Structures are given as C-alpha cells and as structure tokens.
Curated annotation (Swiss-Prot):
This is Fatty acid-binding protein, liver. GO terms for cellular component: cytosol; extracellular exosome; nucleoplasm; nucleus; peroxisomal matrix. It comes from the Eukaryota. Belongs to the calycin superfamily. Fatty-acid binding protein (FABP) family. Changing T94A: Increases the binding for cholesterol; increases high density lipoprotein (HDL)- and low density lipoprotein (LDL)-mediated cholesterol uptake. It is found in: Cytoplasm. Forms a beta-barrel structure that accommodates hydrophobic ligands in its interior. The modification Phosphothreonine is found at T51. Keywords: Acetylation, Cytoplasm, Lipid-binding, Phosphoprotein, Transport. The keyword Transport applies. One of its GO terms (molecular function) is fatty acid binding.
C-alpha cells in the first residue's frame, strides 16, 4: 500500500498546546493555528519524500525506512532518528521526546504526535 499523494488538513486537535510545549513564539501559533494547507508524500518503496505544511511553516523530510535520517523540526533544527514501517499503513518514529505515528486508511491520513500528555492529532484527506 502506498502513501503517495497530496493531502489537505481536515481538522486538528491540540495545535496550540503542542506548539506551546515545543517553544513556538505565540505569534507563530496564532498565525498558524487555523491554516489548512496541503501536505505532499512521494513514496518510492522504502524511500519517502515529505513536503509538509505545518501551521505557517513548510517542512521537508526525505528518508528511507529503517535507515538513519534527519527530520526537520518546527524550530528549524535537524534531529537524527529512524522511521519505521509498522504494517503496511503506519509510519512510526521518535524525536525530541515526541512519539509520532502516521497512519493511512484509504484516503485519510491520521498523524498523531505525542509529547508528554499532549496528543497533537491531525487528520488529512487525499485530494
Ligand atoms: C510523517 C513524518 C515523516 C514522520 C513526519 N511528520 C512530521 C510533521 C507533521 N506531519 C503532518 O502533518 C503530515 C500530514 C498532514 O498534514 O496531516 C500528512 C503526512 C504528515 S506535522 C508537524 C511535523 C513535525 C513538527 C511539528 C509539526 N515530521 O515528520
């Protein structure tokens, strides 16, 4: 099953709480909290390219699952980690104490990022 596609954010929970917890300037939080942009995934086998719209920032990540890679953070910083496949439809990874799980079901992607007790959840639909 392939993740490839262009996805528009439908809804999200805890954007503000999550962004505050990672130290985003309140100014970038209010500007970005209501943006419903488009995220793109290009999948080639175990190689993924992500162009993500997160609030008012565009985040870019390329990686091969199982290999070491660098993920870009909201704050601009790069972090070493590894992204795994769990089943055919779940990408799982951890960085800066954040547990992320990105799951595809048909045309719906559910991105769940957990930091402390904050569950930041984003739901996007293929366009
Ligand atoms: C999945 C992977 C590569 C591990 C990854 N996701 C992110 C990532 C997000 N991703 C999404 O929102 C996504 C979609 C969507 O728009 O709902 C559809 C696919 C991903 S938001 C976000 C970050 C990091 C810092 C904080 C804010 N970073 O790496």
């Amino acid at each position: 099953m392939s993740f490839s596609g262009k996805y528009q954010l439908q809804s999200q929970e805890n954007f503000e709480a999550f962004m505050k917890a990672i130290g985003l300037p309140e100014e970038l939080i209010q500007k970005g909290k209501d943006i419903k942009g488009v995220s793109e995934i290009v999948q080639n086998g175990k190689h993924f390219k992500f162009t993500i719209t997160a609030g008012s920032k565009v985040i870019q990540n390329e990686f091969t699952v199982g290999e070491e890679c660098e993920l870009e953070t909201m704050t601009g910083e790069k972090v070493k980690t590894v992204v795994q496949l769990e089943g055919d439809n779940k990408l799982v990874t951890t960085f800066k104490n954040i547990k992320s799980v990105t799951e595809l079901n048909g045309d719906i992607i559910t991105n769940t990022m957990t930091l402390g007790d904050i569950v930041f959840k984003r739901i996007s639909k293929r366009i």
